[PDB]
Amino acid sequence: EVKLVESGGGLVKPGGSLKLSCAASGFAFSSYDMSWFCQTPEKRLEWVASISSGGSYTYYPDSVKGRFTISRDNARNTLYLQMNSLRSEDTALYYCARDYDYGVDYWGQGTSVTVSSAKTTPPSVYPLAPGSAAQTNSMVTLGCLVKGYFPEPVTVTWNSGSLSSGVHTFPAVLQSDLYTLSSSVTVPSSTWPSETVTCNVAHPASSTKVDKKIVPR
Amino acid sequence: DVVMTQTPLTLSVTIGQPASISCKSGQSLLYSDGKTYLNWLLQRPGQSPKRLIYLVSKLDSGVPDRFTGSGSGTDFTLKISRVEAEDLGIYYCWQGTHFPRTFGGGTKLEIKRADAAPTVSIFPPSSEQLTSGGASVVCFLNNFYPKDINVKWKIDGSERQNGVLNSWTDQDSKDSTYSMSSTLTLTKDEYERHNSYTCEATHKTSTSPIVKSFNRN
Q1: Per the CB < 8 Å rule, is A107 touching B214?
Q2: Which end of chain A has fewer beta carbons closer than 10 Å to its terminal beta carbon, N or C?
Q3: Distances in whole angstroms, Cα of residue A20 to Cα of each of A67, A73, A78, A94, A98
Q4: C-alpha–C-alpha distance, residues B204 and A158, integer Å
């Protein structure tokens, strides 16, 4: 039954504002104290804010006191986190959580927040085909390099999802204040290149979708 | 804020074998009501945190009793009597006794499996990318175990660490291997001033380095 679904995360400029929401269902929302926590890019967990069942009592650590407000609408089974004066160190995955049983019992799915003055930039997508010299051949590995985009995330699939096994898509890295990621796929040397292999890349922030067919060198 | 210290940072365990994790707090976690608000949670890769233990030794009902918690005062231990595949992920202790709530730094649990050699593939910069004036050489090293591996780039025989970025996947929940991409990034002009590019790896699975190389002509 207990379900917690955050929304409202996105890219925000340093000094800007964003309001997150958490829709609760499967339990009597108004009877429970609720909290926000976040997980940083380095995977540290931190407590962000807490609020009493009836909304009367609010608590904040010093890291956010004066900048963030937590509130709830018990008519709408919804918790909120108003975030002002945002800074780059606030970049994190924000989770709502239910306080119960002398701790926290359920966590939400999280909504991602990046605070940065860097602009939304669609990716360049480049094909990774083997060098003109080969060998090894039962299987051949191909890839896409998805370079110079921001903010996160991108999605990568191969032949529109038909393929799945043999694929590795690696976490993005920061390079010139933009993200770069790679994805490899491994197929039988028989099916490539006689059959086509295409990486499909989505970058929802720039409303962009790129197909790149891998062709021999 | 109360400091929470976890030992070890890393565990590597074979299925069916026990493990334990230590949590030490900078101050006693006994609250004035006589209860000790010390908690453990698991975050599996790509999932939300899951409660394990609350009030030091109390077991979350979705968690099997092969997990137990103990301790008092400043010293606590999470024990797993026999590790199973799904135990893969980062374990955290956290305290609710003192304001602000604070978390341990996390202990990453890896599952041991049999040694597996990396599949290594090298890719010259695509034609496309050269037109942007940049050049990335990509090396994939896929499905290896253990995680210990040393990857070097050589240009015309000489080592280069400048412009290299590496990205690792999480341990696969299906085969318990790791994968990594290593990307060497030059300007087109720099790239074009050299002939030989090598991705060289050392791993316990082979008595000699794994070498993948191209010349570019």
Answers
A1: no
A2: N
A3: 14, 13, 10, 9, 16
A4: 32
* Chain B residues with CB-CB distance to A46 below 8 A: 103
Place of tokens 């992920």: B89
B154/B98 same-domain check: no
Give φ, ψ of B6 to 5 degrees: -100, 135
Which is nearest to B89 in space by CA: A89, A153, A151, A39? A39
**Cα–Cα distance, A84 to A158 (Å, whole number):** 40
| CA–CA gap between residue B36 and residue A7 (Å, rounded) | 34
B131 CB-contact burial (10 Å; exposed 0-12 / middle 13-18 / buried 19+): exposed
Question: Residue A106 in contact with residue A4, Cβ under 8 Å?
Answer: yes
Q: Which of B140, B162, B173, B178 would best serve as a mutation to test chain A binding (most A beta carbons within 10 A)?
A: B140
B149 token code pair? 């591996």
- CA–CA min distance A61, chain B (Å): 6
Same domain, B50 and B98: yes
Residue B59 is part of which domain span?
1-113
**Encoded tokens for A1:** 């039954």
